[PDB]
Ligand binder design. Structure first.
Ligand SMILES: [Mg+2]
Lengths: 1275, 97
């Protein structure tokens, strides 16, 4: 019988941190809604204040901008009041929705509040649920801002602000200790008399706390003078209340009426349902008044009534006793000195983990979720890959060099002192010398079209495709990789190819090959991505600007996967000349970031493409993750003196903006990748903004940083990639995280720049030699990356280490694995083989889990082109030996040929029960969940129809000994239906089916004639009839290697009298049936002529006169089944014919099939003559052994490829993997993802070699130096 | 999640019991139909009689899935089988799919 009391505090509680916490919330939908609409409400009332108050009110888009001014003390009473009221309501709301705390009720709880808390108390007490509280809570926000605004107005009219305030709002209240309230009141009266103070300016007792404590308020100038008279032992603690409250001599009923005028009049206002403990009023307990009337009284508690805080404790206790409660459980919300409440109230008295959310709901909303960087590929100066790019950085290489002749002739375009037109003072740069290389065949370009395409568009296709494969992205494989969920963004500032190179002979592909919109467009078109496609031009910040746009799309949910990149290919001498004419460029060398003699930046070439995803999606697909983007923002340097020069004021506001949005602090960042274009003004300006944000200095001069900060610029190595600078900078970070190193900085040629601040004092460093950058245990490395433009815009992001991978995974029980290689060209095929072999030699003995993961990657996480290669084994060494052997044949002159266009054709052969064995299918049953489900489903169907249980056959094995014919036959058929469905799920679409004896039933389901249950019904009831009527051991069956003519000639007695032909399997393969006595006589007669004979294990003699007695009843069983036309042709040994119509599957069919001979030859020969079968078709046995396939093979040709699924002598997966290899080489589209689905241990994307492009140089050389003569006539 | 798992399991049994027809064109056939003009008990007798006279596996039989009112009820079965049974319920009886 405990009663919780909900107590709200006043302005004395520093709610700054609580506000910061609520802004970080993103898991409670009703909170974020309250926090979006509260500022709107707040801002709305602030617009109705007086001009004096509006001028002293800051501008803000969100509450985050008020926190710092609140902490500083420069926030006026109107906002700080509403802010405290927001924090209280916010904390209460979160506690009762996210915190799943039951809402208070009049039976077991009460609410109380002091000063501002009295407002919130009215709202809470007037609602019965969180949903109802919000609308009232928002009205309460407006009342709070009007309350502080009204008290602020009276204060300003009473006393003016003092001169040394510096914007800070002075204190109007102070706590006094060591004297009783009624004694302090007398000293006040005396002090008043002696100073002759006006009645309004007098100090007054604003609150009574305890027998010796109290609080006195007055104008600051007057309060200070009065407090100077209270000498020790008395105490004086100054409180943070910046306006007069609780002053019956300053406020009246009209002031209260004004504060609550924002509450529209209505009849639907809720009443106070939960008792409010109004201990500062005549009635300590109050309830029932309407929300406005209750709010007016609460406002009256703030302006008119003094705080009787000495009555708070007993007032609560008395209400608890009134309801027969023994104790109270305090639930304070932003209450100063709240801990003391519990004991103080109880002194007057005698005295489960949260449930996991449904999958898909645990994830936070898409808005402001970490965006994972899955992969990145690019081309950089002296670097054909990300790995060679790291070599440039870690070895401190300066890649700048004079312009090569492939671009333009420096002898005519460059001059020490440029006087002629279009001649520049510099010709330096960091160039991509292989920018012309491309694989036109791969991307479906003619040799005449490729030269016209901007190398930027080409290198975008290469890097984008490399990044996609590196990320294991296969279109439409998973939900996040659906074609309509993939978008493309690129940053590009220039189109030089279309201005200088192809413009020399405008041809048909001039526009599509030169226009920037085609940079992402070709990516969208080639990979068939129907999501958005954009190009961004913000000059030197384009790529990071595009990364910003892409992240917004992911956060908004327009796409699930994003392709982001940047391109910069320089072929127009005018651009360099123009840049030099504007003094952007360094005429001495590369970017000399941080060097005292920096004279500009050096143009650089680069192309980079990344793959992005919202972190949850990335983890759902088991994609690789190199890092995560926490935030990214953009502003503009509007406050600069010149349009070109950037300014530090705007840059810092951005750095702090992203730190706040991400919830981080300076210490959390350990590295900053700066813009750093090698400019004295730019480097000093940016450096000051970075340190003032990430390495601030104490007021005493010490370092705020506890750990060192490292700053560096990639441009000192590879120059300024302009539109591709942002992603180039980001690529460097991805490598720094991978290798856990900070590369040396080569920008400092001579001496450090003197404009920089004392970096050592701030614990900031410019690494001169490489520095270890290890990931902390159970921690993450976080980075700030900057990228600016001369147009004024600034962009920066916050980066973070990738999450820790899943520890468990699982061991792959499969002994044999399959590795798939593909290429579009014979040369590319040779390349991929070579590159895969060299890769296996590097990672040969690292771990045993590599081979399953290698298989998963090359199959499920790869597209498969027309030229194909395969290898299968149990360890990596076997795979190499196979691929090496295949490589040798390619080198010896046997070229790689593409698989036939249509792909393979399959015929499925369903075996009879003769070849079934114990423990058949157990490994399949264990490992494939779908197979287990089917068996489990069929089992329940059987028992439902009073048939034996087959699930035990796959689990127990021993039962196979004593199993009955009905159980033996059902197990076989369920096995075949489950085995067919498994192969169908793996991509085998049958061209036709053929079943032998019992195998026809499963074959009829695979053909679409019968449903699975009708098959089991038909099989079960037929076997039941055979046990009921027939007897084992009376008849037998005999296999004979001889022609039908020789068998008949050898035996005395015609067929149909002395015996019967049960099966006609081949030319010299027949099976006879009859009584044991009939077979004995025939077996001797055939052995007499030395013909090979052999009994069958079956107990009865199927397909002979023995089954005659069951045929009438079997006819009725078939009549019950629902027959439909086959979807694929049925090769029926029962009729020795290819069946295609349901007219042939009438009940007569099944009695005929049971009694009549099994004419495989006549059925097969009927199939080949129709062209349904030929040597190029693949035969797949759906049974316990390759029996029926041998009959098919004899019928079509000796070179036919036939495969078995199960075989008692070999491992199931060997056969399965060996068949899929041949299906793949034949051109089948295997469902590789399903092949690995039940094996999480293999589901890891490995970093494999990039596609072995068949590269040729496609270039349109700039000639005749015509750019230097633009505007001149022909002379 | 329970709802999707519920329908998936009923869907699995349905597919295992009866295959989708040839002229479905993606449209999912109806397994249940409402009957009017007859009492649930009387309709249950017509079902049992139809069962006796026709040839059906025990699992494929039509069954009374719901009793709505004194003259209303609902009968379910595989689409091909339900069509055959409903063809025997002649006016004044009613049949709403
Ligand atoms: Mg019947």
């Amino acid at each position: 019988a405990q009663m919780r009391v909900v107590a709200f505090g006043d302005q004395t509680y520093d709610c700054s941190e609580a506000v910061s916490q609520l802004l970080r919330v993103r898991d409670d939908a009703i909170v974020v809604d309250f926090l979006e609409r509260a500022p709107a409400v707040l801002k709305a009332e602030l617009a109705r204040l007086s001009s004096e108050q509006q001028e002293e009110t800051p501008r803000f888009a969100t509450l985050a901008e008020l926190v710092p001014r609140y902490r500083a003390g420069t926030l006026n009473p109107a906002v700080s009041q509403a802010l405290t009221c927001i924090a209280q309501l916010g904390l209460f709301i979160r506690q009762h929705s996210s915190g799943q705390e039951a809402y208070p009720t009049a039976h077991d709880s009460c609410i109380t509040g002091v000063c501002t808390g009295a407002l919130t108390a009215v709202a809470v007490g007037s609602a019965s649920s969180v949903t109802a509280l919000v609308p009232l809570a928002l009205h309460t926000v407006a009342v709070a801002v009007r309350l502080g605004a009204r008290a602020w107005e009276i204060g300003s009219c009473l006393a003016d602000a003092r001169r040394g305030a510096n914007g800070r709002y002075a204190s109007w209240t102070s706590a006094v200790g060591g004297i009783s309230p009624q004694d302090l009141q007398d000293r006040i009266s005396a002090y008043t008399a002696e100073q002759a103070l006006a009645s309004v300016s007098v100090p007054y007792l604003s609150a009574a706390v305890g027998p010796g404590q109290s609080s006195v308020s007055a104008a600051p100038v007057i309060l200070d003078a009065f407090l100077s008279t209270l000498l020790r032992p008395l105490t004086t603690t100054r409180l943070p209340i910046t306006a007069p409250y609780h002053a019956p001599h300053l406020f009246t009923a009209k002031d209260v009426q004004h504060v609550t005028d924002c509450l529209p009049p209505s009849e639907a206002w809720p009443t106070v349902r939960i008792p409010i403990i109004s201990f500062s009023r005549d009635e300590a307990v109050s309830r029932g008044a309407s929300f406005p009337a209750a709010m007016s009284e609460a406002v009256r508690d703030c302006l008119i009534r003094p705080i009787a805080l000495d009555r708070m404790a007993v007032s609560i206790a008395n209400h608890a006793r009134d309801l027969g409660k023994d104790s109270v459980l305090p639930s304070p919300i932003a209450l100063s000195f709240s801990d003391k409440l519990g004991p103080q109230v109880n002194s007057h008295l005698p005295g489960s983990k949260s449930i996991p959310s449904a999958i898909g709901a645990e994830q936070q909303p898409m808005a402001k979720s970490p965006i994972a960087i899955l992969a990145a590929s690019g081309r950089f100066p002296q670097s054909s890959s990300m790995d060679q790019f790291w070599d440039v950085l870690i070895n401190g290489v300066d890649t700048h060099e004079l312009v090569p002749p492939t671009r333009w002739n420096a002898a005519t375009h460059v001059s020490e002192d440029p006087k002629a037109k279009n001649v520049s003072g510099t010709g330096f740069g960091c160039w991509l010398h292989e920018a012309g290389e491309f694989d036109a065949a791969y991307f479906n370009m003619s040799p005449r079209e490729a030269p016209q395409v901007d190398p930027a568009q080409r290198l975008a296709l290469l890097t984008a495709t490399e990044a996609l494969e590196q990320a294991g992205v296969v279109p439409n494989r998973t939900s996040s990789t659906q074609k309509n969920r993939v978008g493309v963004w690129y940053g590009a500032t220039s189109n030089d190819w279309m201005e200088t190179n192809s413009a020399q002979n405008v041809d048909t592909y001039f526009i599509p090959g030169g226009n920037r919109a085609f940079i992402p467009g070709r990516v969208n078109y080639f990979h068939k991505f129907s999501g958005p496609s954009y190009t961004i031009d913000t000059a030197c910040s384009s790529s990071l600007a595009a990364l910003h746009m892409a992240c917004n799309a992911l956060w908004r949910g327009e796409v699930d996967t994003a392709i982001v990149g940047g391109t910069n290919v320089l072929t127009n001498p005018d651009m360099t000349a123009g840049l030099d004419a504007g003094h952007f460029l360094s005429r001495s060398g590369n970017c000399k970031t941080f060097d005292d003699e920096a004279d500009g930046y050096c143009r650089g070439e680069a192309v980079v493409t990344l793959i992005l995803k919202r972190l949850p999606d990335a983890q759902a697909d088991k994609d690789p993750i190199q890092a995560s983007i926490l935030g990214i923002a953009t502003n503009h340097s509007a406050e600069a003196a010149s349009i070109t020069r950037p300014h530090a004021g705007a840059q810092q506001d951005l750095f702090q903006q992203v730190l706040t949005e991400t919830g981080l602090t300076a210490n959390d960042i350990s590295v900053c990748e700066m813009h750093g274009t090698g400019t004295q003004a730019g480097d000093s300006g940016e450096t000051t903004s970075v340190v003032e944000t990430l390495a601030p200095l104490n007021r005493s001069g010490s370092a705020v940083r506890t750990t060192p900060l490292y700053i560096g610029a990639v441009k000192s190595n590879v120059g300024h990639a302009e539109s591709a600078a942002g992603v180039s900078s980001l690529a460097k970070i991805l490598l720094m995280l991978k290798h856990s190193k900070i590369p040396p900085h080569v920008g400092i040629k001579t001496k450090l720049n003197h404009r920089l601040p004392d970096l050592a004092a701030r614990n900031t460093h410019i690494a001169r030699s490489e520095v270890p950058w290890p990931r902390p245990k159970n921690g993450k490395r976080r980075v700030l990356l900057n990228n600016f433009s001369a147009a004024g815009g600034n962009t920066c992001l916050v980066l973070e280490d990738a999450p820790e991978p899943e520890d468990s995974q699982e061991v792959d029980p499969r002994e044999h694995h399959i590795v798939a290689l593909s290429a579009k060209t014979p040369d590319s095929m040779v390349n991929n083989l070579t590159n895969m072999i060299t890769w296996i030699d590097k990672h040969s003995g690292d771990s045993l889990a590599t081979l399953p993961q290698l298989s998963y990657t090359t199959t499920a996480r790869r597209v498969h082109h027309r030229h194909r290669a395969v290898a299968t084994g149990t360890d990596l060494l076997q795979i190499r030996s196979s691929l090496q052997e295949q490589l040798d044949r390619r080198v010896s002159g046997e070229r790689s040929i593409p698989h036939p266009p249509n792909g393979p054709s399959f015929v499925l052969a369903f075996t009879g029960q003769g070849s079934a064995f114990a423990g058949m299918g157990v490994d399949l049953y264990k490992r494939f969940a779908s197979f287990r489900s089917d068996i489990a489903r069929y089992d329940q169907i059987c028992e439902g129809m009073s048939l034996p249980s087959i699930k035990a056959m796959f689990e127990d094995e021993k039962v196979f000994s004593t199993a009955s014919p009905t159980l033996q036959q059902l197990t076989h058929v369920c096995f075949q239906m489950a085995l067919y469905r498994l192969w169908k799920s793996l991509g085998v679409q049958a061209k036709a089916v053929v079943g032998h004896s019992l195998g026809e039933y499963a074959a009829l389901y695979a053909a679409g004639v019968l449903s699975q249950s009708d098959t089991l019904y038909l099989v079960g009831r037929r076997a039941q009839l055979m046990e009921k009527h027939l007897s084992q051991g009376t008849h037998a069956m005999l296999a004979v290697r001889a022609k039908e003519e020789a068998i008949v000639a050898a035996i005395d007695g015609p067929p149909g009298e002395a015996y019967e032909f049960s099966c006609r399997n081949g030319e010299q393969r027949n099976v006879l049936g009859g009584t044991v006595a009939q077979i004995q006589a025939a077996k001797a007669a055939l052995e007499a002529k030395k013909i090979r004979c052999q009994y069958l294990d079956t107990p009865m003699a199927f397909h002979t006169g023995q089954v005659d007695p069951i045929l009438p009843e079997l006819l009725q069983v078939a009549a019950a089944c629902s027959i439909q036309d086959p979807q694929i042709p049925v090769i029926s040994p029962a009729y020795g014919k290819v069946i295609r119509s349901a007219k042939d599957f009438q009940p007569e069919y099944f009695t005929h099939h049971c009694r009549s001979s099994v004419n495989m030859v006549d059925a097969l020969q009927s199939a080949v003559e129709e062209g349904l079968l030929d040597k190029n078709v693949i035969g797949l046995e759906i049974g316990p052994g390759p029996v029926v396939t041998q009959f098919v093979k004899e019928a079509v040709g000796t070179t036919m490829q036939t495969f078995a699924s199960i075989n008692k002598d070999k491992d199931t997966w060997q056969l399965m993997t060996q068949a899929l290899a041949k299906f793949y080489l034949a051109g089948a589209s295997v469902e590789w993802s399903r092949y690995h689905e039940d094996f999480p241990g293999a589901q890891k994307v490995l970093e494999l070699p990039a596609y072995g492009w068949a590269l040729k140089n496609y270039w349109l050389q700039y000639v005749n130096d015509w750019s230097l003569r633009k505007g001149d006539p022909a002379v």
